[PDB]
């Protein structure tokens, strides 16, 4: 019996439980410590109990370990790691754990760590004599991802714009930037959910940081995949710690020869958070943004990487533009071109109701050769010389009452290549 | 079959090692030969310079990749003779060591792992304390000649080239530096 | 808040009017706030929706950072750092429940008042609320009453929480009121509104024509 | 025997949407009757107008997918009558229509096309000469009574509901309104 499958369980299937159990006031408190009194009571009566969740090392030697679907949060749901594990199974942070939990002694709370029955999801012997990163190395994006389904739905559209838009590969550095009320959400959710359909192979990582708390739980339940979401409710500390330790899990998962898709929300938010985490270096530019606060969302922005043995690391992050912060403009051109390809949307496109609102013309990629073959090529170079001269709403239009007869795009192509 | 064809893969990959060898101990001398003659041309020199780059860090990954599999050989060796020694006399084992064995059997996790230490430093203790005459042993009989060929100690020239390690960030260097090498004999 | 306004207030509402003046402490005014919102928590939790109003968030979110001790870090302007986290926990309690309730937050701001704490608290909540409402003085000095600013005003997700026709009406109307300017709009909408009774009486007025 | 698998979906999906249009007109003869009562709470006349939306977004969803059925019923029906008729006949057939599978037997695909196009236009020619006779026919053996029962065209009120075209966001919400419809009705 592990604590995930409870946690897991609304608070209902809880409380039952607890009248089940003896806890007759389980309706006071919160989530984390409500399941703290049960899993007492339960290694009180000596029923199995089992852990899984990543581990993490503090400034201290001694590491801690927390859950996945708890927004991940540190609180009294941890559970001890000690450096001797960390040493025999050379274990770092961003290591998942699927380990038996042990009953606490007299004066300690969290649950200890017995030993380690799998490591990041693969046996603890294969990862004690295990490729570190220094061989996993960032390679040029090779594999198309697709994103196109195919019901003749808005959704499906706005896949299919953006597929011809710009191609997107594994292992890329993709970035979007938009104005307000632009269509970020929605654009998210069909990227989140394409790549989920047509790809089950590749598991689905969404962050979310500062962002409304409903947007948080409407996307907990609407993407298949684990989704990352830690709201304006918590400090600016959490958000950046969340930060470093999800990415850092992610490269982790790809150092496993898996490939990892994140979904980062949003970039500027993230800087200025670790402008405010991060003491000042006595040398501020304009915007009250200090040279230091940049270096650590320049790595983080470039961790995005493809891998030539195997596996591939797309960071797909959006932007905020023209919001009124003079700061947000210094990032913008100060991200600029640090990217391997990029989505522009604009404000006048969105406020006629034409949806997707991506700018055809601005946006663009690097190296589309290698990652197309030459006929889809040639056959993306007559899209832009076509849709290039006239404006680029006249051209979102037509595109859009001309896609939407047809089901597919290849037969699209085949259908305007004649015209 | 399967320890015959990792270590026949073993082999193979040992062959493409000396294969490379072979052809940086080429690159060197014929790099030694222009040096020590009349090299008026430097760009034939830089050239060089590229080749014998790419050779070593070549080298480098060929003998560490030849480190694994001859680990990799000898772990699925090693696994393969305690799980038929096991099944032919398992008994006796258990006989000798039971406590631990009904605690790791019906108890609980932690009793299983107080089983396992103790288990654990049992038999080191055993292994510590048996080994003190140090008769010679022989190796398994159905892989006695091919473990004596592929030898417990691989050669010397292996662990000194597979400790060159370099940036992963160089590791691409290394890697486009060799894309355009294999294009170079490629014409 | 000064008297006359508390009292004219506590005689114009229907429901029961929480109100302390200035004349006592920012403690007075931190420890009413919090325990407001949580009892308006704890009465939700019963499946009852509340509305609260709320004047104004910058007074509040100056006595939370004259209240809390300094935490050795100086933002922008002089605001103390964990200091914009009470006022920030406060606002982003608003959510309607899944199970049954809802809580409604409906609380101005202050800007352009001549100082630098208004603009400092402001810049980081321009993007927590999910819904916006505009004010301008240009508007107000020749008597366009309300002074709103419409076209920097709005409500996000607005297909979900009305029907369907009237999500495209208030769209042409929209785009019938961007070219010319926001002030013109303002009294256009007003003579336009003034002859009608009932907002479907407009609707068909601006329809027909 | 897909036919009556076929049939019970059809029949199936009809008593769905059959009963998607009862609570359908049952949402708006109670609103209807709180419309015309001094009902001051202007919220349920809001949440009663979002109902009946949610209910005709459901009843043209349901009528959609009973046509689709309808027109997968009757394409599955013709498609077996045919062809058990063209294995009945199927001589007769091809001595009426030698040249073109003459040519088809053995020529290549644009051929083979050119070929079908001629005998397709051929038998145009044919089949409106003999309809010029314009006789009465009933239905085939063992699938009249699936036709019958099923009817010939679809029931009119299928077709002036679906009428409206709703483009996918519009569905997309529709569907996450009847989600949150489903929901509410579960507490
Ligand atoms: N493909 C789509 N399907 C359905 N609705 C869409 C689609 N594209 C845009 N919209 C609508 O466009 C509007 C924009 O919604 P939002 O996601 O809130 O915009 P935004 O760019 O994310 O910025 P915010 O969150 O509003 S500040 C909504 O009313 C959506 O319903
Ligand atoms: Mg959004």
Redesign the pocket.
Known sequence: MNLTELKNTPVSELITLGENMGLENLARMRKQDIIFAILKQHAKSGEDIFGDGVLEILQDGFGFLRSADSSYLAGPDDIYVSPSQIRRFNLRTGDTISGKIRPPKEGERYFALLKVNEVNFDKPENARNKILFENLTPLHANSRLRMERGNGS??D??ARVLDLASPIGRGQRGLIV?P????????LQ?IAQSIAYNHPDCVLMVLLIDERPE?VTEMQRLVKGEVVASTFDEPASRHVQVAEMVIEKAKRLVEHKKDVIILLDSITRLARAYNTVVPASGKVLTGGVDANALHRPKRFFGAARNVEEGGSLTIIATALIDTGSKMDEVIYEEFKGTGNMELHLSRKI?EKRV??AIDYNRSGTRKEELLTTQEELQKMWILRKIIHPMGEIDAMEFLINKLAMTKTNDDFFEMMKRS | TALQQAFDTCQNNKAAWLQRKNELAAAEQEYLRLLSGEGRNVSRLDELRNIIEVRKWQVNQAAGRYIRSHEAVQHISIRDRLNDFMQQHGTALAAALAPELMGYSELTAIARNCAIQRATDALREALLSWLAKGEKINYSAQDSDILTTIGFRPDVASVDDSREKFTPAQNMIFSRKSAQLASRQSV
């Open positions: 808005t959704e559209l706005t938009a307000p009320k632009a269509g970020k959400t929605m654009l069909n947007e969105a949806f997707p």
